[PDB]
Each structure stands twice: as C-alpha cells, then as structure tokens.
Amino acid sequence: MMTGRQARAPLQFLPDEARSLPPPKLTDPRLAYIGFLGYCSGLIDNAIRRRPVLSAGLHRQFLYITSFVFVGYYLLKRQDYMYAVRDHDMFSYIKSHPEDFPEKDKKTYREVFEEFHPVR
C-alpha cells in the first residue's frame, strides 16, 4: 500500500523524518515485553540443553534480554514511524480532497426518527 511512499529513498530502516518523532521510552511496556521474551528464550536455552534453568549461564540470559531489547527498540521506532506516516498521508489526502470528505450535517435526536421495536 505505502510502498511507493518509501520508494524514492529505498532500504531505509528509519528515515530522517523519523527523527521528528518521539522515540519509545526505555520503560515502554512493549519493550519490557520484548525483554521478557528474551528472558524466556534464555530459560528455554537452559532447558533444552539440560542446564539448571534459572541459575546456569546468567551472562547468556542477560545477552538474550539485551539482544531482544536492542532489536525491539528499533522495531518499535520503525512501527511508530510507519503509523505516523499512515496518519500523515491520510490527513494530507483528506485536506487535499475536500469534495470526497464533506462535513456531514449532524442532527440531534429531536429531529432523528428511529423506529421503535417493542420487546414483548
């Protein structure tokens, strides 16, 4: 859909306009969930190699957590960028096509007739 939008400047994971956007906080709950997924990967890595699950290889568990948080931070940056691009294109298209988006006359319910259906 938006593939011609990111085709004049291809293969940019985060373009330069993405820096206009606020980055995800480090206490982002999505980023905390990705760190939790890294911790679960570290536990499964101890489990399949028959290491003691919570205790063995704390350096390896911490590199799992760190690597998932590291990749996931940039994935969340790109996610928020693409939804911001989606809304920017939507609003610029509505602003440039007023004949397709008229302001509908809102009626109050004193004029609005709705059919009544009795439950009896």
Ligand X SMILES: CCCCCCCCCCCCCCCCCC(=O)OC[C@H](COP(=O)(O)OCCN)OC(=O)CCCCCCCCCCCCCCCCC
Ligand Y SMILES: CCCCCCCCCCCCCCCCCC(=O)OC[C@H](COP(=O)([O-])OCC(O)COP(=O)([O-])OC[C@@H](COC(=O)CCCCCCCCCCCCCCCCC)OC(=O)CCCCCCCCCCCCCCCCC)OC(=O)CCCCCCCCCCCCCCCCC
- Contacts with ligand X by CB under 6 A lie at 6, 10-11, 13
In the chain, which residue ranges form alpha helices assigned H by DSSP? Answer: 29-48, 58-96
Interface residue with another protein, options 7, 8, 55, 104 (CB under 8 A)? 55
| Tokens 């931070």 found at | 73
Length of the chain: 120
- Are 65 and 38 in contact by the 8 Å Cβ rule? The answer is yes
Q: Indicate which of ligand X, ligand Y, another protein, none lies near residue 35 (CB less than 5 to 8 Å, by partner kind).
A: ligand Y
Report DSSP letters for 63-82, one per residue.
HHHHHHHHHHHHHHHHHHHH
> By the criterion CB under 8 A, which residues form the site for another protein?
1-3, 6, 19-23, 26, 30, 33-34, 37, 40-45, 47-52, 55-60, 62-64, 66-67, 69-70, 73, 75-79, 82-83, 86, 110-111, 113-115, 117, 119-120
